[PDB]
Copies of this chain bind each other. A is one copy, B any other.
Amino acid sequence: TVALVVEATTEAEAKKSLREGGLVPAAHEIMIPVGNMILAVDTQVLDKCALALAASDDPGRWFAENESLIHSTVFAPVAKGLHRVYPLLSVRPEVPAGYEASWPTQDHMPGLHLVVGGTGAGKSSYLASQDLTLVIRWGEPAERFDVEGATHAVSDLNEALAVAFVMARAGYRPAIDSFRNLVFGIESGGISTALYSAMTAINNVCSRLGIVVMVVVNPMATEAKAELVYNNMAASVAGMTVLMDGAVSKQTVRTLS
């Protein structure tokens, strides 16, 4: 029931929600700027899904039976004027009252936890150690892990964020493998600055939802500029783990202290 083509042309219609093709977010809609795109998470749909999934005796069966409903948690509004009305849009830094965390580390701030670098088999071996519920697979070549793993395959950034948000909000532990297409598709030392603010935007969405989502990221930096890029990433998110040669090279985490 998301408007796909018809957008507000009167003041009366412009006041409706983003879902209906208006330009004013409802209380339960959070806009997420990614590059020059603007997505929206419907926190009512998100919470309906998280609650159904957290309260289920068979969470796997409800998941499979409502994939379409889960994916609809995030969508791209149709109204073209959003960039103008919300200039230099980000997501505000909020933490829900009573938030608590023990994973990925103790008192980990809600937000993103980037897993960067790694052998490739050092990635997958680090993901296996984190006791994840599933791995959301996006933008990566099909390998064995997609065939007989605890995975969920998606096609676009709406589906990736929607599943991670729903799983984490239901109390489970998701990871996204990976933001490869987000590193390639956003363009503006050596890395597009828009990648950093995209990560802060998605990070602060998780912050507002009181969740952590682990995400694999390969910034494709020359190994000279790699320390400066990794530092600009740590400055954008709640936590970051660098893997070099399959071992944890360094981890830096904002904590609630």
Q: How many copies does the complex hold?
A: 6
* Residue of B95, B137, B185, B187 touching A92 (CB-CB under 8 A): B137
CB of A138 within 8 Å of the partner chain: yes
* Residue of B34, B78, B111, B137 touching A93 (CB-CB under 8 A): B137
Interface size on A, residues (CB 8 A): 84
CB of A61 within 8 Å of the partner chain: no
* Residue of B86, B89, B144, B187 touching A255 (CB-CB under 8 A): B144
How far apart are the CA atoms of A189 and B147 in the complex, in Å? 31
Which residue in chain B gives the minimum CB-CB distance to A208? B142
CB of A128 within 8 Å of the partner chain: no
* Residue of B13, B181, B256 touching A197 (CB-CB under 8 A): B181
Q: Name the segment of A45-53, A164-172, A232-240, A241-249 touching the other chain.
A: A232-240
- Chain A residues near B (Cβ < 8 Å): 1, 3-6, 8-11, 13-15, 23-24, 31, 34, 37, 39, 75-76, 78-79, 81, 84-95, 109-111, 120, 137-144, 146-147, 151, 153-158, 180-185, 187-189, 193-194, 196-197, 200, 203-204, 207, 220, 222, 232, 235-238, 254-257
Known pairs A95-B147, A180-B197, A181-B197 / 18 extra A-B pairs, C-beta < 8 Å: A5-B13, A6-B9, A34-B88, A76-B86, A78-B84, A86-B156, A88-B139, A89-B156, A90-B155, A92-B154, A93-B137, A139-B200, A140-B200, A141-B207, A142-B203, A144-B254, A185-B194, A185-B197
